[PDB]
Paper text:
GCN5-related N-acetyltransferase (GNAT) toxin, with an acetyltransferase activity-dependent mechanism of translation inhibition, represents a relatively new and expanding family of type II TA toxins. We here describe a group of GNAT-Xre TA modules widely distributed among Pseudomonas species. Notably, other than arresting translation through acetylating aminoacyl-tRNAs, PacT can directly bind to Fur, a key ferric uptake regulator, to attenuate its DNA-binding affinity and thus permit the expression of downstream iron-acquisition-related genes. Previously studies on GNAT-RHH TA family also observed pronounced growth arrest after expression of the GNAT-type toxin and co-expression of its upstream antitoxin gene counteracted the toxic effect. It has been also demonstrated that the translational repression function of GNAT-type toxin depend on its acetyltransferase activity which transfers the acetyl group from acetyl coenzyme A (AcCoA) to the amine group of aa-tRNAs, subsequently resulting in the inhibition of translation.
In addition, both the structures of PacT homologues from P. jinjuensis and P. flexibilis are in complex with AcCoA, and share similar fold with PacT in superposition (mean RMSD 0.28Å). Because GNAT-Xre toxins are widespread in Pseudomonas species, which also have highly conserved Fur proteins, we also tested the binding between GNAT toxins and Fur proteins from P. jinjuensis and P. flexibilis. Consistently, both PacT homologs could specifically bind to the DNA-binding domain of Fur. We also found that PacT homologs from other Pseudomonas species could bind to the Fur protein, suggesting that the direct PacT–Fur interaction is a common mechanism for PacT-type toxins. Based on these results, we conclude that the specific interactions between GNAT-Xre toxins and Fur proteins seem to be a common and novel bidirectional regulatory mechanism, indicating that Fur proteins play vital roles in bacterial iron uptake.
Author numbering:
A (entry chain A): 5 to 189
B (entry chain B): 2 to 189
Write the structure that this text describes.
């Protein structure tokens, strides 16, 4: 079920139709940085996420920094029998790269999934050509499970592999510690 | 790619669209084959079939019944469609014990992979199975599918126990060799 997460200036809130135009304008202003994503420039990428929420398939979130939209992220691919899910669909405007915002986002969402949803597995995947995203994920301590061939298209249509990672509930203390270590340097 | 229902045929072997009327016989046969189905989640649960039939309405799965001489002998399905690529999974496969090692699996996979790669023009077909299920692993390896890795805490076994998944796939560039190896095992 839907949730709103916050930590200081950062707020993760359910995505609504009213957010779509500002997200698309921001993505297009940041198009260079978003080349590894599928279609961040398309309104229907955001609306399909809102529709997926209706069908219980996704929880799309808008990232606000001091009340300003700076990007998006989402829970998806729920496996209720386990329970397990994915954090995916993440992007931030360039000026937030390196600022610790991703780490705060991942901490809030991962804490929710493990502590509140009692997940046994949270997975994350990224393009094999997207080295900065791989490093961000590796910094979490997520375990690299393998390379999935022909598993995504990049923004300009090119086929790429995906790298798949996960974190188990057993591993959560480890990951929580590493994120909290970053908060405080 | 359009996820439309199809019948696939080879000799006396037919893969036919699964329908509601089939579910009781499937569940009855799975119950008679409990011992061989212990690594799957829910082959003995009618809802596992019903759910795929429902998902087909929305384009998200194509469940199939395996008939040999018009006799139900097991099941398999296409699922996890990725339309942008396009890509899919072959999963939910089981046969009654009496058909293990009798060549039906290779025929079924040839038919499904041919549809996926030649008609749907897929770039990726994936297959996955429990880390505990070594017979399935060896049968997927015999196809030539490439082992991509182990997914932790990713499934439950029939009785409820958490296990890992081994994930494999076949790409469009690998299909020609997969197809030819399968045909090297067939007559004509
Ligand atoms: C950048 C983004 C992933 C969010 O994270 P972020 O704040 O940049 O993350 P980080 O700050 O930890 O930076 C990532 C790292 O990449 C490093 N980096 C990695 N590969 C590099 C390379 N080839 N060249 C130069 N620098 C590289 C950077 O030094 C940095 O790591 P560091 O802290 O060790 O110095 C994301 O918004 C993005 O902009 N677009 C695509 C999103 C995506 O990939 N989604 C996949 C599914 S969610
Ligand atoms: C998965 C399945 C369709 C494979 O069909 P099959 O006809 O049994 O496949 P094969 O006999 O060609 O291959 C299995 C291989 O593993 C061998 N094998 C059998 N038991 C084994 C075991 N515990 N450990 C390792 N290998 C084993 C078989 O001898 C054979 O190898 P070989 O032909 O080289 O000698 C069938 O076994 C089945 O329905 N199993 C129960 C349902 C199931 O588990 N499905 C998994 C869904 S992912």
């Amino acid at each position: 079920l839907p949730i709103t997460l916050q930590r200081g200036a950062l707020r993760l809130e359910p995505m609504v139709e009213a957010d779509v135009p500002e997200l698309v304008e921001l993505a297009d202003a940041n198009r260079e940085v978003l080349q590894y994503m599928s279609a961040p420039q398309r309104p229907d990428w955001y609306r399909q996420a809102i529709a997926d929420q209706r069908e219980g398939r996704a929880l799309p979130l808008v990232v606000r920094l001091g009340n300003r939209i700076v990007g998006t992220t989402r829970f998806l691919d729920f496996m209720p029998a386990l329970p397990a899910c994915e954090i995916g669909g993440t992007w931030l405007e360039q000026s937030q790269h390196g600022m610790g915002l991703n780490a705060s986002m991942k901490y809030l969402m991962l804490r929710h999934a493990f502590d509140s949803w009692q997940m046994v597995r949270v997975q994350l995947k990224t393009a094999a050509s997207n080295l900065r995203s791989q490093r961000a994920i590796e910094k979490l301590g997520a375990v690299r499970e393998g390379v999935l061939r022909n598993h995504r298209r990049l923004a300009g249509g090119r086929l790429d592999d995906s790298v798949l990672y996960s974190i188990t509930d057993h591993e959560w203390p480890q990951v929580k510690a590493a994120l909290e270590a970053g908060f405080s340097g």
